Amino acid sequence: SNADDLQMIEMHELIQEFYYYALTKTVEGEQALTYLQERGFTDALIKERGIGFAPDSSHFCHDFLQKKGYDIELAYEAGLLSRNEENFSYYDRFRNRIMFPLKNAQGRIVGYSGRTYTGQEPKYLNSPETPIFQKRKLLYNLDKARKSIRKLDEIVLLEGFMDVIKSDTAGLKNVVATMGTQLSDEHITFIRKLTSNITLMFDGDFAGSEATLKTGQHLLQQGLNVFVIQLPSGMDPDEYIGKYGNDAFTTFVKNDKKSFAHYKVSILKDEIAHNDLSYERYLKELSHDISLMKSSILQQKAINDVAPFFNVSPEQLANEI
Length: 321
Ligand SMILES: Nc1ncnc2c1ncn2[C@@H]1O[C@H](COP(=O)(O)OP(=O)(O)OP(=O)(O)O)[C@@H](O)[C@H]1O
Ligand SMILES: [Mn+2]
Ligand SMILES: [Mn+2]
Ligand SMILES: [Mn+2]
What we know:
The protein has helices at 2-25, 30-38, 43-49, 60-67, 72-77, 142-152, 161-170, 185-194, 206-221, 237-244, 246-255, 260-267, 269-274, 276-292, 296-306, 314-320, and strands spanning 52-54, 81-84, 89-92, 97-103, 109-115, 124-126, 155-158, 175-177, 197-200, 225-228, 258-259. By secondary structure, it is α/β, with parallel strands linked by helices. The chain has 3 domains: 1-134, Alpha-Beta Complex (DNA primase DNAg catalytic core, N-terminal domain), CATH 3.90.980.10; 135-259, Dna Topoisomerase Vi A Subunit, Chain: A, domain 2; 260-319, Pheromone ER-1 (Up-down Bundle), CATH 1.20.50.20. The strands form 3 sheets. A 5-stranded mixed beta sheet has the order 8-7-9-10-11, sandwiched between helices. Strands 1-4-5-6 form a 4-stranded antiparallel beta sheet, with helices on one face. Strands 2-3 form a two-stranded antiparallel ribbon. A hairpin with a 4-residue loop joins strand 2 (81-84) and strand 3. One manganese (II) ion (MN) binds at residues 159-160, 203, 236. One manganese (II) ion binds at residues 159-160, 203, 236. It catalyses: ssDNA + n NTP = ssDNA/pppN(pN)n-1 hybrid + (n-1) diphosphate. One of its GO terms (molecular function) is DNA helicase activity.
């Protein structure tokens, strides 16, 4: 029910204040606080994002919610508590982790992502699916990013909410991330209401490239204008910012932004030039890709940019399309 959803949100927003205190003031939170500070989190940024610490007792959140008069089973359904199925007892889902509030599109806290700071697995532990937290619907930072996304007519998609936090403070405001999932049909429906331009900046590794191609292809097929920023090998946006600084990052992002078709053929360059079977298949793929582009201006430019990779004239490629 809507009333229960609201109670679940309240539980999240109230425990947030306690996690924040635990992180910033208490003895047990000191090591987690140092960890964040060493990753460049200022006191201001920690306060701004409402970041906190979940103690290791296993009954910190449980006891707080109980004292405040919440139904414990509802707190379990809200994904704040876990249940020992053997004796039906409840305990904290999040223990000894740095707590990042996850806000819905309306800015209400509906879940958490808890990061280890001691090399434990999983590195990030999220809320489970609940009536108020659904990974296929939530986009980290969307609440804050919406204004600039509309103003700039562009959304930028990163892999990690940590990348989003760092990019945002660096000056790149129109950024969001999924909670570690593939961009959903639902996400895409939300996004197209805000803008038709989406820029993918995944990590600069093989996995990120594969994800860029798969996600980009689907976005393109869905009628969006897709762009790609390619980070240096082995780097994500947080690592780039840490090594080169904010101004370098915002300049980098603004300098090399390529239409998806151009990015794709550049990735396939060597295979196309060495394997005639791939040459033919990718010439047809890229022809199809370009034919999907809704922007007549960008479609014409992509033709010019892609043709050389096949050693054909832009006129020949235009004909193939
Ligand atoms: N095996 C996995 N299963 C589910 N989600 C994952 C997995 N690996 C990564 N993710 C999610 O994808 C996003 C990107 O992961 P990645 O490890 O690159 O994060 P990150 O920002 O590098 O983390 P950190 O900088 O804190 O080490 C993260 O937010 C994470 O939640
Ligand atoms: Mn990766
Ligand atoms: Mn990363
Ligand atoms: Mn990282």
